[PDB]
Amino acid sequence: ANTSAHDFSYLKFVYNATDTSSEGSYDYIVIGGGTSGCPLAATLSEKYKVLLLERGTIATEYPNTLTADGFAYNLQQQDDGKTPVERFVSEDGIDNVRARILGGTTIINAGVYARANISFYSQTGIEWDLDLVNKTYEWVEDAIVVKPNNQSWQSVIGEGFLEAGILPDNGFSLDHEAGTRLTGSTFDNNGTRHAADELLNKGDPNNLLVAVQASVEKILFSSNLSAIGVIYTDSDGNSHQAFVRGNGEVIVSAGTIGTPQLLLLSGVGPESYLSSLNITVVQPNPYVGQFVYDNPRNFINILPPNPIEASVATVLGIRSDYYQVSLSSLPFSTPPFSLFPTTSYPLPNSTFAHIVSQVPGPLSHGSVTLNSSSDVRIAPNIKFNYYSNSTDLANCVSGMKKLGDLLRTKALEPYKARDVLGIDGFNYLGVPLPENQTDDASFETFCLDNVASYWHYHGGSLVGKVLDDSFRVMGIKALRVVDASTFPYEPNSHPQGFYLMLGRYVGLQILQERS
Numbered sequence: 428a429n430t431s432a433h434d435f436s437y438l439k440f441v442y443n444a445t446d447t448s449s450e451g452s453y454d455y456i457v458i459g460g461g462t463s464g465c466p467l468a469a470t471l472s473e474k475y476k477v478l479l480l481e482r483g484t485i486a487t488e489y490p491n492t493l494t495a496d497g498f499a500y501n502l503q504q505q506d507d508g509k510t511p512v513e514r515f516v517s518e519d520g521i522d523n524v525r526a527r528i529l530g531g532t533t534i535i536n537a538g539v540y541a542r543a544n545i546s547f548y549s550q551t552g553i554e555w556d557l558d559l560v561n562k563t564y565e566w567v568e569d570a571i572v573v574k575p576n577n578q579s580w581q582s583v584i585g586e587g588f589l590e591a592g593i594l595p596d597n598g599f600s601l602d603h604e605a606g607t608r609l610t611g612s613t614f615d616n617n618g619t620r621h622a623a624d625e626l627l628n629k630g631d632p633n634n635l636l637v638a639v640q641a642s643v644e645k646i647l648f649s650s651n652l653s654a655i656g657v658i659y660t661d662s663d664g665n666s667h668q669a670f671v672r673g674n675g676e677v678i679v680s681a682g683t684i685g686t687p688q689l690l691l692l693s694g695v696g697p698e699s700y701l702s703s704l705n706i707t708v709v710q711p712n713p714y715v716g717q718f719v720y721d722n723p724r725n726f727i728n729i730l731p732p733n734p735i736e737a738s739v740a741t742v743l744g745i746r747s748d749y750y751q752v753s754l755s756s757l758p759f760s761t762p763p764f765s766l767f768p769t770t771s772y773p774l775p776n777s778t779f780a781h782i783v784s785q786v787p788g789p790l791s792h793g794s795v796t797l798n799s800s801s802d803v804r805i806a807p808n809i810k811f812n813y814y815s816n817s818t819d820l821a822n823c824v825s826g827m828k829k830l831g832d833l834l835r836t837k838a839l840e841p842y843k844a845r846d847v848l849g850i851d852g853f854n855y856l857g858v859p860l861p862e863n864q865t866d867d868a869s870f871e872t873f874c875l876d877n878v879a880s881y882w883h884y885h886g887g888s889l890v891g892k893v894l895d896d897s898f899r900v901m902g903i904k905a906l907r908v909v910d911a912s913t914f915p916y917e918p919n920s921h922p923q924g925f926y927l928m929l930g931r932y933v934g935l936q937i938l939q940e941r942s
């Protein structure tokens with residue numbers, strides 16, 4: 428991509444769910460207009476009639492989702508039930524967010540773009556067409572990814588990472604590789620956010636209908652079981668149904684949280700569990716909503732004596748055991764929800780730099796369960812079980828030690844408040860790295876007590892547990908699942924790139940079958 432305005436041309440075929448027919452018929456129904464849903468929708472409409480169903484509204488309604496500068500704003504904004512950010516708390520007690528908007532989490536994220544680690548393909552076991560994977564990345568990148576310009580704070584952390592030993596220097600690259608690099612962004616060089624919603628512009632406007640403020644509450648089934656259609660409600664509280672045509676399919680792309688939720692409500696999940704809630708079992712499947720993962724975030728905040736310019740994350744320090752990045756920010760009197768793990772967290776009075784490490788995997792996991800057994804608009808229960816696996820914890824320790832090395836660099840020295848020898852010359856917001864304390868146990872305590880969400884949560888409808896190699900729900904015809912719920916491990920440090928590619932890639936697979 429180059430600099431241009433967010434392209435809203437697709438609005439010519441976006442309708443409020445209140446204005447759709449009571450009973451619809453399409454070749455394809457895509458539930459959830461997010462990261463995978465949008466390009467899958469657009470792709471299938473090249474040839475067939477597609478209905479895309481999104482519970483949120485359109486991003487024009489929320490202007491702060493449209494700029495690089497607006498990132499904190501949407502997180503700070505209070506959740507009223509219609510806003511683009513939906514707040515929740517895991518049962519672990521860590522604050523967290525998901526999207527509720529057309530374009531999905533790409534409309535609210537930090538804009539970091541990367542391709543999957545090339546070892547990911549062989550690790551899964553799926554026979555990926557790697558040529559086509561690449562062409563599909565190229566298609567996303569041409570539409571919404573730029574090579575970012577220089578930002579001074581990112582250039583400092585760039586020199587710090589090299590100095591601290593995060594080698595080699597990869598230059599500018601979109602590939603997930605060991606070492607330091609400038610990567611891509613879906614924020615353009617004029618501050619404008621580009622997102623999955625713009626990929627709708629690649630669709631055929633006479634094949635694709637997008638319905639917004641559509642809350643999909645049930646998948647509909649025949650009595651050789653098949654998905655036949657969906658029930659959705661509109662903003663007026665009225666019910667609508669939509670059915671698939673011969674050889675067409677329902678695709679669930681409701682995300683890590685919404686997919687298991689929808690499947691469970693539709694009677695696809697653990698049998699004795701669904702029976703305890705008086706839901707009719709259509710397909711017993713023990714793994715619907717199991718193996719849900721959230722990569723932990725651990726961080727420090729430095730307050731420099733001189734002001735620093737605000738920046739979006741573009742520069743990455745990759746090792747096999749920890750993925751590091753940094754953001755610099757203006758001060759605020761209102762906390763951006765889930766930037767810090769709870770609400771009782773000190774407020775910065777000046778510019779600060781948020782310096783962050785991510786645990787790969789992770790190995791720890793929990794579940795998504797129903798809270799309401801009938802209402803999709805009531806959030807499900809989610810538990811991540813942060814640091815129940817000891818390999819996760821060790822990896823956090825390693826990452827935190829690397830952050831110490833980063834803070835000892837000459838590159839970071841001018842941002843110290845006091846010119847002493849140690850890292851206590853920095854002023855901090857919140858908890859410093861264990862001060863003077865060298866041994867592993869101090870880091871472990873730091874990791875466990877100050878963990879945040881990295882927001883890259885995945886799983887709950889896994890390939891191999893619920894899905895086959897082609898993303899079909901096992902035992903059920905004409906049903907697929909395509910979003911972040913499909914994999915038990917991260918494809919790289921920043922997964923939007925992979926899930927954008929996956930929306931289209933699965934679409935092309937489907938279109939090849941129809942040939």
Ligand SMILES: Cc1cc2nc3c(=O)[nH]c(=O)nc-3n(C[C@H](O)[C@H](O)[C@H](O)COP(=O)(O)OP(=O)(O)OC[C@H]3O[C@@H](n4cnc5c(N)ncnc54)[C@H](O)[C@@H]3O)c2cc1C
Pocket residue numbers: 458459460461462463464480481482483524525526527528529530531532533535536537538539540541641642643644680681682683685686689803881882883884909910911912920921922923924926
């Ligand atoms: C604050 C934040 C910052 C992040 N920063 C980055 C980053 O910088 N780079 C990066 O690569 N990744 C980042 N990520 C992670 C990445 O954005 C997500 O993993 C990815 O976007 C998820 O895609 P998805 O298709 O699974 O879900 P989504 O894109 O959320 O798609 C789900 C869509 O389904 C809709 N939906 C849910 N239930 C229903 C229903 N019942 N009926 C109809 N619609 C429904 C939702 O409203 C949503 O629009 C970030 C995530 C967050 C939350």
Ligand SMILES: *[C@@H]1O[C@H](CO)[C@@H](O[C@@H]2O[C@H](CO)[C@@H](O)[C@H](O)[C@H]2NC(C)=O)[C@H](O)[C@H]1NC(C)=O
Pocket residue numbers: 430431432617618619
């Ligand atoms: C550069 O960025 C500005 C925002 O700083 C963009 O201005 C917006 O673009 C469209 C016009 O196409 C308007 O509908 C919005 O009202 C504008 N927003 C703001 C905040 O002013 C501008 O389009 C960008 N320029 C280019 C060429 O991409």
Ligand SMILES: *[C@@H]1O[C@H](CO)[C@@H](O)[C@H](O)[C@H]1NC(C)=O
Pocket residue numbers: 542557558561602
């Ligand atoms: C796909 O792209 C990567 C760069 O991202 C490259 O190194 C690899 O060889 C490509 N694979 C194919 C099959 O073209």
Ligand SMILES: *[C@@H]1O[C@H](CO)[C@@H](O)[C@H](O)[C@H]1NC(C)=O
Pocket residue numbers: 577582
């Ligand atoms: C941007 O990148 C590097 C420093 O990070 C340098 O080679 C180059 O001069 C910079 N370009 C501009 C236009 O400032």
Ligand SMILES: *[C@@H]1O[C@H](CO)[C@@H](O)[C@H](O)[C@H]1NC(C)=O
Pocket residue numbers: 544545546547550603604605745746747748
């Ligand atoms: C890429 O993936 C492989 C296989 O999952 C993993 O062992 C390796 O560490 C990854 N590389 C990086 C740099 O994260």
Ligand SMILES: *[C@@H]1O[C@H](CO)[C@@H](O)[C@H](O)[C@H]1NC(C)=O
Pocket residue numbers: 797798799808
């Ligand atoms: C639903 O959520 C609340 C916390 O938000 C929890 O205390 C309650 O037990 C949940 N209900 C069910 C049925 O799990």
Ligand SMILES: *[C@H]1O[C@H](CO)[C@@H](O)[C@H](O)[C@H]1NC(C)=O
Pocket residue numbers: 790791815816817818
């Ligand atoms: C998690 O790590 C491995 C890999 O899944 C697993 O076999 C083990 O049971 C877990 N470790 C701990 C300490 O529970």
